Design an enzyme around this catalytic site. Structure first.
Site, PDB file in Angstrom:
ATOM      1  N   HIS A  76      -4.471  -7.781 -17.319  1.00 35.26           N
ATOM      2  CA  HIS A  76      -3.150  -7.649 -16.753  1.00 35.26           C
ATOM      3  C   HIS A  76      -1.743  -8.281 -16.723  1.00 35.26           C
ATOM      4  CE1 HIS A  76      -4.935  -4.303 -13.852  1.00 35.26           C
ATOM      5  NE2 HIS A  76      -5.950  -5.594 -13.458  1.00 35.26           N
TER       6      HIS A  76
ATOM      7  N   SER B 192     -10.122  -1.905 -15.849  1.00 35.03           N
ATOM      8  CA  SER B 192      -9.206  -2.430 -14.286  1.00 35.03           C
ATOM      9  C   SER B 192      -8.023  -2.017 -14.743  1.00 35.03           C
ATOM     10  CB  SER B 192      -9.219  -3.779 -14.314  1.00 35.03           C
ATOM     11  OG  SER B 192      -8.281  -4.606 -13.345  1.00 35.03           O
TER      12      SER B 192
ATOM     13  N   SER C 211      -4.616   0.007 -12.675  1.00 31.86           N
ATOM     14  CA  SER C 211      -3.136  -1.287 -12.843  1.00 31.86           C
ATOM     15  C   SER C 211      -3.071   0.126 -11.586  1.00 31.86           C
ATOM     16  CB  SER C 211      -2.276  -1.795 -12.980  1.00 31.86           C
ATOM     17  OG  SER C 211      -1.278  -2.330 -12.207  1.00 31.86           O
TER      18      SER C 211
ATOM     19  N   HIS D 206      -0.941   0.390 -15.523  1.00 33.20           N
ATOM     20  CA  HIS D 206      -1.624  -0.259 -16.999  1.00 33.20           C
ATOM     21  C   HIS D 206      -2.762   0.464 -17.050  1.00 33.20           C
ATOM     22  CE1 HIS D 206      -0.386  -3.797 -15.565  1.00 33.20           C
ATOM     23  NE2 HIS D 206      -1.856  -3.604 -15.757  1.00 33.20           N
TER      24      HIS D 206
ATOM     25  N   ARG E  95     -13.206  -5.229 -10.799  1.00 34.22           N
ATOM     26  CA  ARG E  95     -13.233  -5.373  -9.583  1.00 34.22           C
ATOM     27  C   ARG E  95     -14.165  -4.424  -8.533  1.00 34.22           C
ATOM     28  NH1 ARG E  95      -9.303  -6.991  -5.320  1.00 34.22           N
ATOM     29  NH2 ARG E  95      -7.901  -6.424  -5.756  1.00 34.22           N
ATOM     30  N   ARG E  96     -13.748  -3.473  -9.466  1.00 33.92           N
ATOM     31  CA  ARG E  96     -14.332  -1.534  -9.091  1.00 33.92           C
ATOM     32  C   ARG E  96     -15.959  -1.807 -10.053  1.00 33.92           C
ATOM     33  NH1 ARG E  96      -9.461  -0.570  -9.130  1.00 33.92           N
ATOM     34  NH2 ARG E  96      -8.538   0.228  -7.422  1.00 33.92           N
TER      35      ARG E  96
END
Ligand code: CL
Ligand code: CL
Lengths: 4, 226, 227, 4
Positions: free
Chosen positions: B53, B122, B124, B134, B142-143
């Site tokens: 990120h 991940s 966003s 993105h 996290r998922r």
């Protein structure tokens, strides 16, 4: 916004 | 040989699920149902691909996103020469990379380093309390089920996921064929700094293995290190 | 002053911790290292300090080694300017480091980055199947339990982190690091970055680190340890 | 030599  | 070095620094594709519909997130903010995904997809130019990120660590773009029976799947492409060169150099100093890949896969240092360091995806996106901002390559998402699969060929990477159908792939192939300057603004020190953070994510490996099993990349051969 | 703070960050950093704990049965025979052997070897046989056993990644030296009631304890010193500069730069990009240390400790980016990345100590010695001790390595986790690495700017302070050590113990160490060539580091950021992915695949890294923390009692003290 |  949520960042994973 | 500057020949091998040029082959190592060639583009690298990455694919995997950004979210799995049959998985209940451990945090409400992570909920992302099919209806929402499909609605958002219809609405919302290529999304950037970055490291954990960090907008100064963009390494490529997302070439295709597709909602399927089991979740939201995406395929991205690491194209940043600066990033790839850094990875090339680091891969030369990884004992894990030196041990090489499994069964009959040919060694691919860059791909292997990426598989190990950024084993997860991940997304966003806008909070649920241009929806998609993105996609980030990270140590673990996290998922759950967000295992990142790296490879030199987009077809090959998509073929790593047994859940996907031929129709599913056509929808993806259509996208990465349509879409088909270095945006990276960080450096080795930056990635090194990010590495210590990854070392303190709890249950990193267990989560990765869980993702591997869920998406069935376990029953396939790939460069995944988890 | 940036150049002022930057010089303070790149100052030497001390590290201490047990290389082996006598009351711990290794999960591998090759790791056995009893007190008698240690003390004998100590009587016979400065050892270099490196990153994960890579001789091209020497960052300092061991200033003192001492066998105590609970095990073999050592104190080293990271002196390599090249290595420290790299660490300084990376520390600036770590979210973990940004969150800072606990309770009343002052933040120390370099020290904190080292605490997180190389939380363990790993001795390099002759097989047990003169110079018995080859070197000490800073690593993500040691193979011998209780080898938690404790970083700090002052040798006294670091030794004071371990409740098992006695005043006598410290005097023996102080004597050594007080009695005790050019930057020996021969690697770079890419090297350390490469080494980092290896650390990510050591199984049960955190659980082992916490276990070490509890065993050596650095849990009941305040330090820069991130585990 | 054994490395830990
Ligand atoms: Cl990451
Ligand atoms: Cl290490």
């Amino acid at each position: 916004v949520d960042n994973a | 040989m500057d020949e091998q070095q040029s082959q190592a620094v060639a583009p690298v594709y990455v694919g995997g699920f950004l979210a799995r519909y049959d998985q209940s997130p451990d945090e409400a903010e992570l909920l992302l149902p099919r209806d929402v995904v499909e609605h958002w997809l219809h609405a919302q130019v290529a999304l950037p691909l970055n490291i954990n990120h960090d907008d100064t660590a963009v390494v490529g773009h997302v070439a295709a996103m597709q909602s399927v029976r089991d979740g939201l799947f995406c395929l991205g492409c690491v194209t940043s020469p600066r990033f790839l060169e850094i990875v090339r150099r680091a891969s030369e100093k990884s004992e894990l990379v030196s041990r090489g890949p499994v069964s009959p896969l040919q060694p691919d240092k860059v791909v292997e380093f990426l598989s190990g360091s950024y084993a997860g995806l991940s997304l966003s996106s806008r909070r649920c309390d241009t929806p998609f901002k993105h996609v980030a390559l990270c140590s673990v998402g996290r998922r759950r089920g967000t295992l990142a699969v790296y490879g030199r060929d987009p077809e090959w990477v998509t073929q790593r996921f047994p859940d996907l159908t031929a129709a599913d792939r056509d929808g993806l192939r259509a996208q990465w064929q349509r879409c088909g300057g270095d945006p990276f603004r960080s450096d080795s020190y930056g990635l090194l700094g990010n590495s210590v953070d990854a070392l303190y994510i709890r249950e990193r490996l267990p989560k990765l293995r869980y993702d591997k099993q869920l998406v069935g990349v376990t029953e396939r051969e790939s460069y995944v290190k988890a």
